[PDB]
């Protein structure tokens, strides 16, 4: 049940809501008021999802799919079988997510650490809210949201993309991808660096941070340092997801045409717009 050093940490307090009421654990897990909140939202949501599955007449997970209301319903409510169920399920997800974040906050307090983790998570939550709330509202129907199904959701991605041409040309999409790639690069390195120091060549003594900083200056002439790379990681990650939201929130709202075409602005600057030759002249 407890890690060899856990007991002295399991003291009362830190709860945001409800005092000592839910201030307790279940196996390794911490409950807290929000422990309960998330459970309830999670229970409800899964139920509704199964209920959608009978109306659909399949129990096969590769097939199950809960779709939003069709565009004709705009931002109004829709019949269960006709889009209501997704709308509730979406409400329930949100409930789950936010609650899961606030529990993280409550654990943070009991342990006496910073709130960076709940913090970073809120970016994930905000990306999800962008795709099922902010964008549809702004566009004008729940129908612009993505459906909850394993492959159907990949389909929405593909269809929504190809609507504006090759989505690769969405400029904030370019930026968002550069982080995803960069972050992975940096996670690759960080991990590798620490391990190689902690697990040197056979029979040698554990290396030190000094070695880590040296290994990198030797390699590329600079080392961001042990505090840096952790600040770096948090940032690349949060940024990747920040730009991911951005590229979507603008798509279909302030730009509805082909993304490639938006680049004509550059190429049509009057100072070289008419100069012959090249690719565009």
């Amino acid at each position: 049940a407890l890690l060899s050093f856990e007991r002295k940490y399991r003291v009362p307090g830190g709860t945001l809501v409800g005092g000592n009421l839910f201030d307790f654990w279940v196996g390794p897990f911490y409950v807290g008021f929000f422990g309960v909140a998330t459970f309830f939202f999670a229970a409800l949501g899964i139920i509704l999802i199964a209920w959608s599955a009978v109306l659909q007449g399949t129990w096969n997970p590769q097939l199950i799919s809960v779709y939003p209301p069709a565009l004709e319903y705009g931002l109004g409510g829709a019949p269960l079988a006709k889009g209501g169920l997704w709308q509730i399920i979406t409400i329930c997800a949100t409930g789950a997510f936010v609650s899961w974040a606030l529990r993280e906050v409550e654990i943070c307090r009991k342990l006496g650490i910073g709130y960076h983790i709940p913090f970073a998570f809120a970016f994930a939550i905000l990306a999800y809210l962008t795709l099922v709330l902010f964008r549809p509202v702004m566009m004008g129907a729940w129908g612009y949201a993505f459906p909850y199904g394993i492959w159907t959701h990949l389909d929405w991605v593909s269809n929504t993309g190809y609507t504006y041409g090759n989505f690769h040309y969405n400029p904030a999409h370019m930026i968002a991808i550069s982080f995803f790639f960069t972050n992975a690069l940096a996670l690759a390195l960080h991990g590798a660096l620490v391990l190689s120091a902690a697990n040197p060549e056979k029979g040698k003594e554990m290396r030190t941070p000094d070695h880590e900083d040296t290994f990198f200056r030797d390699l590329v002439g600079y080392s961001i340092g042990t505090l840096g790379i952790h600040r770096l990681g948090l940032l690349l990650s949060l940024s990747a997801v920040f730009f991911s939201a951005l590229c979507m929130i603008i798509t279909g709202t302030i730009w509805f045409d082909q993304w490639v075409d938006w680049w004509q602005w550059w190429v049509k600057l009057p100072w070289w717009a008419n100069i012959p030759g090249g690719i565009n002249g």
Binding site: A1, L3, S4, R7, G13, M206, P209, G225
Partner: protein, 240 residues
């Protein structure tokens, strides 16, 4: 076909890999225990990994994990219920006792050494050629606690030499003794240094270091521990 082969293969690879990953993270704090310290009955599907031994630089010996676990300090906590899973209430002053968000681990009572075998962290006064190169130099600024009362004055900065970084502020108290304050728990302002976790009256309780030009892993933990714990336990004294 080949493709089918490859993907089935991979899902198998991936499964033994997680297994590996998982057993490696079982190198500390395992095996599990009951609230009374007796070994718990259900330790999960995963076995303890076979021990590995680390050779610590500067002849500081070896470390073998997993290995015999022991807190090596008293815990002043008492059960608040008759069944498993409820908090344990401090039986004294959690701060003074070092439980809760004020907990510290019995790390070695030796300082962290740099790659050369010299003390990693030093008061800047004794760090030949170090200076505040940017930002507000705290040194000389009064220190304010969450109760908005002055508690002391910065009389130095303890720097991390190999990473060239400010780790702690040393503070001079009203009785002429000094304490270290983690850099990460204070806001350096234009005319003062503000500490939200501790009220002026608790600065004296901050554990002291035995030698004035060195800190040990044990003393770092006891200090950081203490200051962090203020956040929850000084709470009645904090106003804003």
């Amino acid at each position: 076909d080949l493709a089918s082969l490859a993907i089935y293969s991979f899902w198998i690879f991936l499964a033994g890999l997680i297994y590996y990953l998982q057993t490696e993270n079982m190198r500390e704090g395992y095996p599990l225990e009951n609230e009374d310290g007796t070994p718990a009955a259900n330790q999960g599907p995963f076995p303890l990994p076979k021990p590995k031994t680390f050779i610590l630089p500067h002849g500081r010996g070896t470390l073998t994990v997993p290995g015999p676990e022991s807190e090596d300090r008293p815990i002043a906590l008492a059960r608040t219920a008759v069944s498993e899973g409820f908090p344990h209430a401090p039986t004294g002053d959690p701060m003074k006792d070092g439980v809760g968000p004020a907990s510290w681990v019995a790390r070695r009572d030796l300082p962290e050494l740099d790659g050369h075998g010299h003390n990693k962290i030093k008061p800047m006064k004794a760090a030949a050629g170090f200076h505040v190169s940017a930002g507000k130099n705290p040194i000389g600024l009064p220190v304010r606690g969450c109760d908005l009362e002055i508690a002391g004055k910065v009389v130095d900065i303890w720097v991390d030499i190999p990473e060239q970084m400010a780790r702690f502020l040393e503070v001079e108290l009203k009785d002429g003794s000094t304490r270290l304050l983690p850099m990460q728990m204070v806001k350096v302002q234009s005319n003062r240094v503000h500490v939200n976790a501790l009220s002026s009256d608790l600065f004296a309780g901050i554990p002291t270091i035995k030698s004035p030009t060195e800190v040990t892993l044990l003393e770092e933990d006891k200090i950081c521990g203490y200051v962090a714990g203020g956040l929850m336990y000084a709470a009645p004294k904090r106003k804003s």
